[PDB]
Amino acid sequence: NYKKRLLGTAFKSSPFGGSSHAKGIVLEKLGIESKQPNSAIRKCVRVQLIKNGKKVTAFVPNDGCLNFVDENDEVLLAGFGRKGKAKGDIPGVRFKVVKVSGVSLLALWKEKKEKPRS
Amino acid sequence: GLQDEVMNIKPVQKQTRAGQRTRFKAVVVVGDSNGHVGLGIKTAKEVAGAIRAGIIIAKLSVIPIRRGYWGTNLGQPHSLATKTTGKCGSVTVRLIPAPRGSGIVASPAVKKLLQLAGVEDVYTQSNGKTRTLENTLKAAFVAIGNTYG
Amino acid sequence: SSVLADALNAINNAEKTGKRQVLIRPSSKVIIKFLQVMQKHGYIGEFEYIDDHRSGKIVVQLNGRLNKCGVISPRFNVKIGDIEKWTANLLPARQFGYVILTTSAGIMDHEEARRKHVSGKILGFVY
Amino acid sequence: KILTGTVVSTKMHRTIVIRRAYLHYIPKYNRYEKRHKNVPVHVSPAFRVQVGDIVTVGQCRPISKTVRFNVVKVSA
Amino acid sequence: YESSRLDAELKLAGEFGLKNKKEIYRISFQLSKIRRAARDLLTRDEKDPKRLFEGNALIRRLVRVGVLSEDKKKLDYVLALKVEDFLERRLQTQVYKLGLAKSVHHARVLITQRHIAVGKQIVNIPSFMVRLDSEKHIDFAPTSPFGGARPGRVARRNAARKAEASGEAADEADEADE
RNA sequence: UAAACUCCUGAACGAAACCCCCGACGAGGGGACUGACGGUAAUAGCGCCGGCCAACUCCGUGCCAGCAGCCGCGGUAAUACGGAGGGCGCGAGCGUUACCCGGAUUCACUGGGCGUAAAGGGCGUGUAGGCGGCCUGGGGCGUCCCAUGUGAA
RNA sequence: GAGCAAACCGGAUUAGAUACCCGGGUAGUCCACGCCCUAAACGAUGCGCGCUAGGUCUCUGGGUCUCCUGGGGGCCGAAGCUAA
Numbered sequence: 001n002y003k004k005r006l007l008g009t010a011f012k013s014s015p016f017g018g019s020s021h022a023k024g025i026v027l028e029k030l031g032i033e034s035k036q037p038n039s040a041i042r043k044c045v046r047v048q049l050i051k052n053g054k055k056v057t058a059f060v061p062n063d064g065c066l067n068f069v070d071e072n073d074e075v076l077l078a079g080f081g082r083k084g085k086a087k088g089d090i091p092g093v094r095f096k097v098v099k100v101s102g103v104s105l106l107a108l109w110k111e112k113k114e115k116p117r118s
Numbered sequence: 119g120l121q122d123e124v125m126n127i128k129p130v131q132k133q134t135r136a137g138q139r140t141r142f143k144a145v146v147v148v149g150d151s152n153g154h155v156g157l158g159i160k161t162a163k164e165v166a167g168a169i170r171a172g173i174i175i176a177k178l179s180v181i182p183i184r185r186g187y188w189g190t191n192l193g194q195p196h197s198l199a200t201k202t203t204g205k206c207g208s209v210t211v212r213l214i215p216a217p218r219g220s221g222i223v224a225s226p227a228v229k230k231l232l233q234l235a236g237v238e239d240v241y242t243q244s245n246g247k248t249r250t251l252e253n254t255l256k257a258a259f260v261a262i263g264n265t266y267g
Numbered sequence: 268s269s270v271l272a273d274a275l276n277a278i279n280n281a282e283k284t285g286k287r288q289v290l291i292r293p294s295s296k297v298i299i300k301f302l303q304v305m306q307k308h309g310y311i312g313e314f315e316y317i318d319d320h321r322s323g324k325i326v327v328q329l330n331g332r333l334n335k336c337g338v339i340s341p342r343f344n345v346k347i348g349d350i351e352k353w354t355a356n357l358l359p360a361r362q363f364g365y366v367i368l369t370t371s372a373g374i375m376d377h378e379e380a381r382r383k384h385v386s387g388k389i390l391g392f393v394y
Numbered sequence: 395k396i397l398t399g400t401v402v403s404t405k406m407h408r409t410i411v412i413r414r415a416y417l418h419y420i421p422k423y424n425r426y427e428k429r430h431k432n433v434p435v436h437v438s439p440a441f442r443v444q445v446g447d448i449v450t451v452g453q454c455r456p457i458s459k460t461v462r463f464n465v466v467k468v469s470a
Numbered sequence: 471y472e473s474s475r476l477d478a479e480l481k482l483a484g485e486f487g488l489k490n491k492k493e494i495y496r497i498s499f500q501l502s503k504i505r506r507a508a509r510d511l512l513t514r515d516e517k518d519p520k521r522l523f524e525g526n527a528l529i530r531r532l533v534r535v536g537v538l539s540e541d542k543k544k545l546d547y548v549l550a551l552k553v554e555d556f557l558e559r560r561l562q563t564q565v566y567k568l569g570l571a572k573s574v575h576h577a578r579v580l581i582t583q584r585h586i587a588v589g590k591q592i593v594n595i596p597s598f599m600v601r602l603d604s605e606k607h608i609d610f611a612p613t614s615p616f617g618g619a620r621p622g623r624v625a626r627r628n629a630a631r632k633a634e635a636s637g638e639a640a641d642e643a644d645e646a647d648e
Numbered sequence: 649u650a651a652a653c654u655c656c657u658g659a660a661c662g663a664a665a666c667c668c669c670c671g672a673c674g675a676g677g678g679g680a681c682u683g684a685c686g687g688u689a690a691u692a693g694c695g696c697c698g699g700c701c702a703a704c705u706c707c708g709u710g711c712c713a714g715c716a717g718c719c720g721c722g723g724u725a726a727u728a729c730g731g732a733g734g735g736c737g738c739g740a741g742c743g744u745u746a747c748c749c750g751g752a753u754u755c756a757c758u759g760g761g762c763g764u765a766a767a768g769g770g771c772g773u774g775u776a777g778g779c780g781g782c783c784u785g786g787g788g789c790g791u792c793c794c795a796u797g798u799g800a801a
Numbered sequence: 802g803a804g805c806a807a808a809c810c811g812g813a814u815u816a817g818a819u820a821c822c823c824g825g826g827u828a829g830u831c832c833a834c835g836c837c838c839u840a841a842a843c844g845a846u847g848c849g850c851g852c853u854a855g856g857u858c859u860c861u862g863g864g865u866c867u868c869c870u871g872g873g874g875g876c877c878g879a880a881g882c883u884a885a
Contacts, residue, residue: 417789419790425790426789426791428789
């Protein structure tokens with residue numbers, strides 16, 4: 001080109017359609033470990049989104065029981081949070097699964113006393 | 119009729135043998151609002167001594183910014199006579215006059231000077247290197263000196 | 268480079284040293300025209316034609332003050348050879364100091380240009 | 395409208411190719427850009443205009459495809 | 471809006487007559503004095519209150535500010551419209567200013583309820599922009615708070631004759647007028 | 649009168665259809681009709697309080713469950729997780745997800761740089777191209793001004 | 802093709818020694834013709850021009866030659882610049 005073109009800004013979440021939410025199907029209910037010093041088993045899930053048709057990894061909030069996510073449960077991805085990513089904890093997870101909504105297969109953690117239920 | 123506003127006071131710490139010891143610096147602007155302004159920076163172990171020291175220093179070294187002043191010939195009511203662009207080092211500052219109600223639209227370094235300057239309404243722009251210290255401030259100061267009218 | 272830039276630079280450089288006089292530069296019709304405004308605006312004590320080695324030059328009287336940095340603290344070229352800078356009467360620009368423009372009308376200060384209602388390359392700004 | 399140009403080519407029948415040159419301010423850049431275009435102009439007598447003439451072309455109804463101009467007259 | 475108004479007036483700690491009413495901040499330190507805020511605090515806090523006062527949506531509010539911002543002169547008052555520009559110009563506001571209603575909300579309902587007139591034509595649009603030289607009369611069928619209004623003085627920019635229960639927007643009131 | 653306390657001015661306009669005259673189809677003046685409901689105190693706030701950034705204590709939890717914009721926080725004293733109390737700011741909406749522009753002068757013109765941080769080409773010769781000393785005269789292409797047309801809604 | 806010396810062949814040192822030390826030694830190092838085209842190819846600083854205190858040593862030319870003036874190489878330093 002006349003001048004080299006630099007890479008521009010990229011959107012944080014490509015839920016495609018710039019949509020607020022996208023629904024996908026769980027491929028696998030994996031568990032990833034944190035980075036930096038923190039350690040634990042963060043519960044995550046690969047999801048096949050309809051919109052992008054993209055496959056993504058999403059965080060599953062709440063202590064949950066075991067959690068209510070299985071091999072092929074329908075789920076909604078919020079991108080909850082600005083990015084919806086958990087950078088400090090787990091790289092590669094762009095979105096959060098909304099179970100607060102309790103929409104789809106993701107059930108809400110029951111009887112959660114604390115306010116984060118919201 | 120010397121208004122006295124204080125730009126700000128900083129703690130300015132220093133380290134010496136096994137020990138930190140701070141002094142205070144106060145920047146004080148003094149002006150008639152009729153065309154005379156002075157800036158003085160004085161330091162002292164205590165904030166008050168510093169401010170008073172600065173005020174006295176500011177009183178010395180006064181400069182005739184051409185804004186409005188006491189009813190006589192008029193400067194520009196809280197605004198500048200004309201647009202000037204000044205480059206100091208990599209820093210370039212641009213000042214453009216504005217009508218009343220515009221406000222002082224500028225980045226902080228430029229703003230802080232223009233306000234004590236007595237300018238109420240201006241449109242500004244910092245371009246090039248924006249080291250506030252390095253030359254944005256110096257650049258602003260030169261820009262002000264340059265103004266005629 | 269640019270003759271005009273050279274002149275502004277020479278004065279800028281000389282003032283820093285605080286030279287009373289300065290061969291601002293070899294004389295040119297345009298350069299002298301510029302100096303005349305510099306005089307009227309009060310930036311320089313004045314200038315004079317001088318003969319150096321049978322070549323015409325313009326001595327520029329520097330004019331300084333007691334308080335601090337030179338009377339002409341600023342002086343920066345704007346339009347430059349790589350990119351010319353032309354401005355409409357609309358955006359002459361304003362600052363506390365003046366800008367010297369060159370118009371078909373002649374070289375005028377920003378205020379003067381406004382009066383004439385003319386535009387032109389913006390040679391430089393001083394204040 | 396009316397344009398002025400030179401007859402670059404006599405070769406065709408009843409037609410002449412006139413090369414009009416134009417300068418103008420470009421709306422975006424405002425740079426003064428110059429470009430020229432060739433227009434086929436209708437020449438009925440086929441003796442009217444010879445190569446080298448400067449002529450004024452005038453907007454006309456379509457005579458032929460890719461021809462919307464008639465030789466108004468000879469400038470020279 | 472139509473949410474708990476009272477708490478907002480407190481906490482903004484600025485007098486807000488969401489009703490005509492009292493200033494003290496609701497919680498933790500109603501008593502303690504809080505004073506001049508920083509520019510930053512001022513900017514955000516200013517937004518919510520300037521808006522909250524009018525009880526208007528951000529969408530409407532934004533347009534008004536943008537216009538006042540472009541025009542030269544201090545944005546704040548020009549924006550403010552004591553009668554000056556925009557904000558107090560709204561018909562709903564004027565009725566409040568006129569004393570027809572005790573509060574801005576009440577005025578809003580009056581205007582919506584149709585108990586208001588402008589130029590005799592009845593207008594129930596609170597967003598209605600009142601221009602200078604318009605009369606804001608109280609609907610014939612209605613008539614009430616005018617009493618008690620008798621002693622109260624009115625902005626120089628406006629005026630009202632208690633008898634007709636009419637009033638006029640004389641001119642755009644300056645912030646000083648505010 | 650603020651409080652304490654007692655009770656609840658009055659939501660539950662909607663109507664313009666089926667204008668004329670003077671005055672600028674405006675303001676104003678004169679010459680359209682029509683409401684059963686018809687008088688009750690009568691839905692709610694949301695975000696945040698580790699630093700940036702205004703707002704801190706107890707309890708629960710124990711690298712878990714979770715938070716997270718960045719730096720980061722949680723492995724038995726956590727102002728960073730959940731609740732509570734308290735606090736700061738200002739919910740007929742509020743918050744999330746997706747996508748576009750912004751911040752990004754990060755495809756730095758405004759407005760950045762290259763001794764050692766990323767960055768001088770191993771050096772020269774020279775093509776295209778970019779740039780060009782002093783004085784006078786012609787032209788008026790750039791440049792500036794005026795008028796006019798266009799710049800729909 | 803004298804000397805030197807990757808690889809290689811030996812000696813020693815070492816826990817091991819595919820190394821450093823010692824004895825040998827081929828390519829190569831030299832010449833010609835052609836090719837390769839790299840580098841801490843470094844001032845880690847592209848070229849030209851103008852302007853902005855001086856001091857000191859030095860190479861080369863001119864001068865009225867105990868110093869001035871021109872070109873070049875170093876050191877110290879005004880103003881200024883720089884994150885230092």
